[PDB]
Design a protein around this ligand. Sequence first.
Ligand code: YRE
Lengths: 221, 253, 242, 233, 210, 247, 246
Amino acid sequence: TTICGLVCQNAVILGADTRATEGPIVADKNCSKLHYISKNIWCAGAGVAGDLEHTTLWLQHNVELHRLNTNTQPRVSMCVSRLTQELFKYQGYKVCAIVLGGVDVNGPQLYGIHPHGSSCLLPFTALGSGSLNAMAVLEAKYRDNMTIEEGKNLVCEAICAGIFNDLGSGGNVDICVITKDSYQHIRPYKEPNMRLYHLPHPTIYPKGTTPILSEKIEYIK
Amino acid sequence: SMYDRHLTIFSPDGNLYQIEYAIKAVKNTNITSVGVKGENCAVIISQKKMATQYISQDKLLDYNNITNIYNITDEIGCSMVGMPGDCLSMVYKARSEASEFLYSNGYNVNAETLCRNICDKIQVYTQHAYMRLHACSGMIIGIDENNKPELFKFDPSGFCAGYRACVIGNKEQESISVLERLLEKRKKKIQQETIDEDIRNTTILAIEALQTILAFDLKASEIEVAIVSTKNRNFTQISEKEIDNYLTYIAER
Amino acid sequence: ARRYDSRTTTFSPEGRLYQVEYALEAINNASITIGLITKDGVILGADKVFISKLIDKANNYEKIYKIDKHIFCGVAGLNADANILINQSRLYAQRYLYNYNEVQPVSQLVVQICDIKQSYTQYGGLRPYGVSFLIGGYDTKDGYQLYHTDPSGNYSGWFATAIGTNNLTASSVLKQEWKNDMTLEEGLLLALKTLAKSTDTEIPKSEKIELAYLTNKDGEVYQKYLTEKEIEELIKLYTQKY
Amino acid sequence: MADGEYSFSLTTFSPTGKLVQIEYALNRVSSSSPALGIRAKNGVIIATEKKSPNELIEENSIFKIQQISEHIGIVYAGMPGDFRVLLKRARKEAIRYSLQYGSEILVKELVKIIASIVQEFTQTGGVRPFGLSLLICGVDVYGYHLYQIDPSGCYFNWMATCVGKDYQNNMSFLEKRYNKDIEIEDAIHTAILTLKESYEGVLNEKNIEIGVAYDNKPFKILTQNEIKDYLIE
Amino acid sequence: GSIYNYNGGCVLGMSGSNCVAIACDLRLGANTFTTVSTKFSKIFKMNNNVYVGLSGLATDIQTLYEILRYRVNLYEVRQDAEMDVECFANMLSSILYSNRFSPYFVNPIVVGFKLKHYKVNYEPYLTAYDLIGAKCETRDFVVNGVTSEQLFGMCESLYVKDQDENGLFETISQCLLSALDRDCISGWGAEVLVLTPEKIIKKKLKARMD
Amino acid sequence: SAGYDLSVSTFSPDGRLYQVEYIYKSINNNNTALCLECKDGIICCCINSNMDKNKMIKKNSYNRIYHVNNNIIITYSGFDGDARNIIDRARSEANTYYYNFHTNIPLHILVNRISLYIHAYTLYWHMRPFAASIIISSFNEKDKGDIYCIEPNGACYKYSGIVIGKNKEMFKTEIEKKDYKDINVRDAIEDIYKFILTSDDHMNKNNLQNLVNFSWICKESSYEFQNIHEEILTPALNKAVEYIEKL
Amino acid sequence: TTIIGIIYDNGVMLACDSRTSSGTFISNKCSRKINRINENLYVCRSGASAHSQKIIEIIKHYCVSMKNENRKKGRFHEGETIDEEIDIDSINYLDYNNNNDNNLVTKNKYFYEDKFNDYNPLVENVAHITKKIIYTNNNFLSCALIFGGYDKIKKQQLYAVNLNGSIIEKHDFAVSGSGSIYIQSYLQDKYKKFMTKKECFNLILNCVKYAMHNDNSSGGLIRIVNITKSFVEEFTVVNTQMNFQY
Ligand SMILES: O=C(NC1CCCC1)[C@@H]1CCCCOc2cccc(c2)C[C@H](N2CCCC2=O)C(=O)N[C@@H](CCN2CCOCC2)C(=O)N1
């Protein structure tokens, strides 16, 4: 996995590859790693797939409940507190390394959350198996006060570094831009990987080639 | 049944008379508090008076300790009127609710939500027969996350709401008339105020309102005034000297 | 606080349980619910209580409920208590299926729900459930079945019966007209007759009738909740036959 | 207290079979500010009377129309604290369903769960029933729904209904001019007209709250200006 | 790891045009090499539009199937409708995760139709799971079981988009059979279910029995 | 009354809680306790005049003055058992405060906690409310005296001098004549004995020795709890007695 | 990690490096190991990041509760009426970085709201409740903390909460983290009683610089917090390199 995020002008930008592996096998080639928490808060997930899916769903629904009961814009700090407390409660056995980003009254914020429950407010970060490659690119090229287009290009370059240099990453590049007034989830954003060779004609088995022992037809309604 | 006015159960007409009697118990304390909202601030003024209760006021009583204004947090305070045991109990409930909110969510609760959570607590007393009602009505002020003042008021029935200005006390229809007159008089001016001018006008309006309600000359030593503003978001009382200066200005006008 | 206790689960000087008698009075004050067994399935019929012409009369059955695929009930009494117990009985049927990998026999389900009701009459200090159930179903052990439950946790099997208001008239009509080998159509027409005669009229009204039946056909048990159109067809057939 | 010998039913059967506490809660509802809902062709509207006691109170601080989830709204007639508790519970159950099944809670499922919660308080020991009625409107895959929940825990499916003060006369007014093939605008006008006929005096954009769910869109509470436009005619 | 080798088995899902197919081997292993049954189906019908394939430990297969049947039956009786396939998929994920730390040793797939009610449109729906409920939504095919690598190779090489029911049957059957022929602990028969909005066709393949 | 006075959890139609008022009556019928702030300390006195006919009680064995951390005086008027309960709770709160923070619990926080404890027994329909009012007080050089009195309803107020129990009004009338913030505790002893001789008509110069508990926290005792020695109470008792018998 | 506290004549100074690492990899270049508990009470974090972070969050909550319970009823102080600034810019000047990034806030200063220290929790109380929390779960928790603050009773104070949940008060200086072992004797030799603000600042900065030079687990930038009776000053130093004549 390669997930990354950075802060730019009045916006937070997240990026992710889309590979899920089961051992050395690619289990999902187009899995989504960018998760909607609220209109102004998203997060990218690396680690155990099931933990990420269920932790981000729980966080999203609790955040919506909080928003309804208070009628105020959700805070990124609240997501940090809730998530870190949960993860700490599980002493790192919930393997969730999360880049959390959003925009609220305190402006654009980005946090790197670790499975044991620590958090860190940062201008940029990357997590996952490809985080070292993406961090190389981000450290080389990050700047304060980038425009959204520049930030998108840099996030894409970082994710591509992870995709092409880490075996655990691959697939397409997904991006989300989170501003004060809305978000923009682009999926796919890059699509750098496709099948190169195709056979000149797809194998179509003639009808009746497979031998069968029994057959029953059962109609519906 | 014969006990429909003893427990929190409906009477034939649909009333819960225990709630009415708890409200009357609040009214019996003879304590008056007034909260007023400005453009960038909010004020609460209360009498530094012992609630009319079984015991009376001794001349060895330390009158500085008598108060009905409390801090819930650094930035949220309130006035609690009613039975002093119940008022202290509600103060502690509100403080613990605010602290729990802060720990759970990593940011301070604003006044509206704290009032609503308190009232959700009170509703449980209104529905469960084995608990007495808390004879306590409160006013809560603070500055919300958009730098706007908040003024909210709860009462024993668990009903809360926001206000431009409010009064807890024996009389409240006539207090409402006085407050409405003061607010429209303040609003009819078109000149823009400074932060300090706004705070001064709000405090003067609160003092003059409490005075026109109680119908006697307030002495600075016998009232308390607490403010929250965008200049100083902390809920802080003001000195007896500043209250006295506001009173001298009010009288000479 | 004992002065406020109404002592629901306490014997009366005649070995009676007053809360149960009052719950039975409430059930007797509810609209008529009838049931009868043919050779083609169990029929449940009910009179709908009018509230307003603005009620949504589409796919809205409020007196006959599916418990499982092979079980369904009619309700007489407090509808919210009935909703509680119906949820419980659906849970019970599914629990039996989970534990035994086969569908629950009807009598066992009736026994479980009646145990809930009896327990409320014996333990605790709460009021009993104010509902009577007409539970019908099919299973291989006992074929088509029909049961009647009351607030005391009692029950009993029936070939035809009625609960709710004016059950005496409907029961007499069933006693005179119910036969041991009836077809589904004959059963439906007899159900319409007893519903019409218990509601003090001669031609029944589709707007006020809930009719459903439960058949074991070709090995599948299948429940049919007649719409207003199908009931209108049956009303025309009834007015032909009478 | 809440356990031991002191947990006995406060709602019990009378000789005639009635549960008088439920009747008294019903009276309490019938004395409350009117509310109503209308199921139109491509949406459902819930409207309420919100009469400000004084010029001091902040209207926005009091909303009798609340959102439970996207596409589901709720209004009540009766005691407001009870309403707050039940609204919090409804939101909780909506998110519990959403966590189990991913998608949004179906209106019928929510209504059944909330009705069961209401019913519990007419049987469990040491409590009174809730003193309110709820109207729950929503849109899901299976169409538009308008449900009422009574203090006893019974629920009804409505094409249009009114709860609270003099709701029989309001019901006659609403049934005189409701068809199942109305539009959103016609429904809003009808709701406003019904409330006018009930309210004594002159209504305005501050005396009424309105919530809509139409054309497969998220539930929306009409602002002051939108209601003002609806009131221009 | 070896727990999954105790019984063996695999499941495979595939979609065509207005059709979807689910297939499984029929073996019940014991001790990784002893075949004790040849009619142990891994395919279960939740409702007419929702099937689940459960590979892994047979005890956990049966237990999870019973839990899922309980949940689906309760949901559908309460709602008075058939459970949507996506709601069922999310529910299965939640059930598997609820046992996150002592999980059911199962490798499920879900195959069925997502109904888009206007008339009704039937969109094939496929999902593969891990034992703690992570989900992989797909349009072409899903695989699970100890034969996963062979099924992945066969599907990547042979799957053809938008096949009719007969083409779908031939393709999924060939994929399953070729994959099974390379596995020591799977096979001994194959059942293939081809789903259309109108009918279900259940076939047993004349497969290898060694 | 009218049936509204059988439970502490039922408000009367006029808004009053009658069980609390009945407890107040019980307390006002019980023995007298007072605490007085002086220039260099606070002085507490309990007059056990209800025990005047109990001739066989061991001399000076019944004492109503306790302490919390060796620097806070806590006394009461009302039921002994309830007061012991509340004092146990006060000490438990002091222990917990030290455990959590390693400093002694401040007087005002302890007062709030005790008052909340007491108030919690007025809320339910199955618990008897405490029939006792509590005096809690301390004194140190920098802060001078702090005296709080907690009511059975749970209301705590701060005083310069307090009298609870029987004949409290006459005692307050006598106490209020002089500003004791400028008098020393030793000098206040004789005043208190004179007040006892006058106000409590059940007390004479014969049982003044065995019926009165005296304690203080003052400069002489290093601002820590101490029962006043009989070698200090004796001359003061004799002087008050002779002065009174003169008039 | 290197965290230091030094008591000087008019206050207490807290300094730290900012590097957080997982092995040899630096996961966070510039963490924030000096955290405000109350307006006049800070803690320096050492040990496992998750442990110290969650402990400090709990302690902040406890401190809010204590502070609001410390508030007395009434009004007070109706009459009561209540140093050479560090040239931080010159400390942070480097030839090769001059206006390369003009916008850079390297300093902040604020005044106490509780001017008389009427309700601010005592430093000792907060430190001891923290020690209690760590000790109760010292089978799992591994983090060492330094508390620094000012209260009206004991003035400027340092409390070291060591691993396993013991507490020691320091009256001169406190050091923790893998980097402080290297500067142990340097600080011991250079420390004197009643140092000025300038001397204390230079000393604490040089201590952190030497520790970062010698310890791979330390690095990044340097954060210095100065706590006085009336205000708190915070500085960031980015000129951390060490130049040896030899
Ligand atoms: O890519 C991955 N994360 C990214 C992809 C999206 C979010 C981020 C990880 C990368 C490796 C992590 C493996 O550490 C585990 C620790 C504990 C439990 C499990 C895994 C569970 C399970 N295990 C463990 C071995 C047997 C088995 O089955 C397993 O490997 N899960 C796979 C995904 C499974 N499939 C679900 C449906 O189809 C898509 C993939 C998985 O979590 N991979």
